[PDB]
Design a protein around this ligand. Structure first.
Ligand code: NY7
Ligand code: ZN
Ligand code: ZN
Ligand code: ZN
Length: 572
């Protein structure tokens, strides 16, 4: 009820009642909000509404102070002062960017640009507002009910009339009814139940709309530079394996926070785990948004760090499987691996936040609120994929606007850059180096002579909006007959519907570009499927072709990206 101004910090009792997060505003800033926007409801212990019986005047510009009460122009007493006058709204202890964050619908790219270019408190206001908007949008969707059960993995659904149907992919996680979370993939639909239960007919699912908590901590803590390693104790016996990162590990101990840009296969988790060997007494918390990113850090830690000092933090609501080898939920172990939403309230000597392109400003802030650390390290790559922005439908979100860490990496550059790709055949490294890394990424591997490209537009069909290209899958099938070593390839495309078709026709394991991020395979077969902004996205393209260790086959739709691929072209 009585708090601090989200703009200039000048204490007040005035909260905007029209803002979905109800932020406190000072006398000066509340005025500049109500007179420039449709937002006219002003709060305190008592709201600014006409006290005269049965009067519906709530607009603060049409209200006045009659002693210690509030009334409109039609009900005010002779001795009454306007609540809105002289650039101020009457309150105790007596902006363009704040207005736009407060009133935008978050469907445009410019809304996200602003949410990242504004002041720090406006970043938290923006992150709270966006997350709250995203959750209330889930409520707009229709309830799905089980009509019949075909088998242990297939079912038929009945939808609510009037309310739209959400897109079916492993992106949208429903909550069965409390029979556990469930996901869907396309009249022959497949049901992916997180908890194994006999799919009851009549039982329904609904999109988990968790409540949005307020943000207290900043996205980035204030930067501190030191002239000596602070609170960390190095070794002069770090294995040659991690010696390439000694100068960077020291930079970590000489700054409050540091950023690491690591292109694919340049040694990000090797750097992250090697930081524990360089400061062997330090308590380190390894965090990331996804369970898969946390698990990939667990796998590297399992190889170099003592297993008895490790613990994998798993929340009670087990939404999918997790890394099994560390002791579970022992919050007190020297090494703690946990997702951002499951983080306990604790301290650390170092906090490592991985896959930073997937973080939102909300995630950056939660980490600063749940973890108080001597040093924070942000590992990721702004040339890789960002978190899906479900409300964003107009415009494209550039990497400098993914989050505060990405913004720093794209404007002032990263503190540390891993320049040598050790995963990919040089054809791939040379392509992405020119495409997204300003020719600064170098190849450790030779050219494999197993990277191919084919320009084939085929025929584009759609499953609602998720696209399919059966002729591009036909070309893959023909290629497989002539190149049987490729029988072990992973099939990748920008669309679930393309992947579902390729799975039945080719029999290859399937993966979307977005779900492939962080993973590597010997052989990759990629079909572009369409020439949309989604399938032409250079960060998505970069992720797609950098999954391969040995060979890649790219069936392309876009001439531009095809021409850039430094691969042997194939005929047909
Ligand atoms: C657009 O570049 C290419 C396209 C196709 C092939 C076979 C090679 C290159 N470029 C190189 O191998 C580096 N000069
Ligand atoms: Zn203010
Ligand atoms: Zn408002
Ligand atoms: Zn009135």
């Amino acid at each position: 009820a009585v708090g601090a101004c989200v703009l200039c910090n000048s204490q007040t009792s005035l909260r905007c009642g029209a803002c979905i997060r109800r932020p406190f505003l000072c006398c000066k800033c509340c005025y500049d909000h109500v007179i420039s926007t449709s937002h006219k409801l002003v709060l305190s212990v008592n709201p600014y509404v006409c006290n005269a019986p049965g009067c519906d005047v709530t607009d603060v510009t049409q209200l006045y102070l009659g002693g210690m009460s509030y009334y409109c122009k039609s009900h005010k007493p002779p001795i009454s002062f306007p609540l809105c006058a002289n650039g101020q709204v009457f309150g105790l202890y007596k902006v363009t960017d704040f207005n736009a964050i407060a009133t935008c619908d978050w469907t445009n790219a410019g809304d996200y640009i602003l949410a990242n270019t504004c002041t720090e408190r406006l970043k938290l206001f923006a992150a709270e507002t966006l997350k709250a908007t995203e959750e209330t949008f889930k409520l707009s969707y229709g309830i799905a009910t089980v009509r019949e059960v075909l088998s242990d993995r297939e079912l038929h659904l009945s939808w609510e009339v009037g309310k739209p149907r959400p897109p079916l992919n492993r992106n949208y996680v429903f909550t069965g009814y409390q029979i556990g979370e469930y996901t869907f993939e396309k009249d022959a639909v497949v049901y992916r139940g997180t908890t194994t239960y006999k799919l009851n007919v009549g039982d329904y699912f609904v999109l988990t709309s968790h409540t949005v908590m307020p943000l207290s901590a900043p996205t980035l803590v204030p930067q501190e530079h030191y002239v000596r390693i602070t609170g960390l104790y190095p070794t002069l016996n770090i294995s040659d394996e991690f010696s390439s990162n000694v100068a960077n590990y020291q930079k970590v101990g000489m700054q409050k926070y540091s950023t690491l840009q690591g292109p694919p296969g340049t040694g990000k988790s090797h750097f992250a785990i090697g930081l524990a060997l360089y400061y062997p007494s330090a308590r380190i918390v390894y965090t990331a948004c996804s369970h898969a990113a946390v698990d990939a850090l667990c796998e590297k830690a399992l190889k170099y760090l003592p297993i008895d000092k490790c613990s994998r933090i798993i929340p009670a609501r087990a939404r999918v499987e997790c890394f099994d080898k560390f002791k579970v939920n022992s919050t007190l172990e020297q090494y703690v691996f946990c997702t951002v939403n499951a983080l306990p309230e604790t301290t650390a000597d170092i906090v490592v936040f991985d896959e930073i392109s997937m973080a939102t400003n909300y995630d950056l802030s939660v980490v600063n609120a749940r973890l108080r650390a001597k040093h924070y390290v942000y590992i990721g790559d702004p040339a890789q994929l960002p978190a899906p922005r479900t409300l964003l439908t107009k415009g494209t979100l550039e990497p400098e606007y993914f989050n505060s860490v990405c913004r720093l990496m794209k404007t002032i550059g990263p503190d540390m850059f891993l320049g040598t790709c050790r995963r990919c055949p040089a054809e791939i490294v040379d392509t992405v180096s020119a495409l997204v890394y300003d020719n600064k990424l170098k190849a450790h591997k030779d050219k494999s002579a197993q990277c191919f490209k084919m320009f084939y537009k085929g025929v584009i069909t759609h499953d609602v909006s998720s696209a399919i290209n059966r002729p591009q899958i036909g070309v893959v099938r023909e290629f497989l007959t002539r190149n049987p070593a490729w029988r072990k390839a992973v099939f990748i495309s920008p669309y679930n519907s393309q992947n579902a078709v390729a799975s039945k026709i080719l029999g290859l394991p399937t993966q979307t570009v977005d779900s492939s991020q962080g993973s590597e395979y010997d052989y990759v077969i990629f079909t572009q499927t369409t020439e949309t902004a989604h399938s032409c996205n250079v960060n998505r393209f970069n992720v797609a072709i950098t999954r391969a260790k040995v060979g890649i086959l790219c069936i392309m739709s876009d001439r531009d990206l095809y021409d850039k691929l430094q691969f042997t072209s194939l005929e047909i």
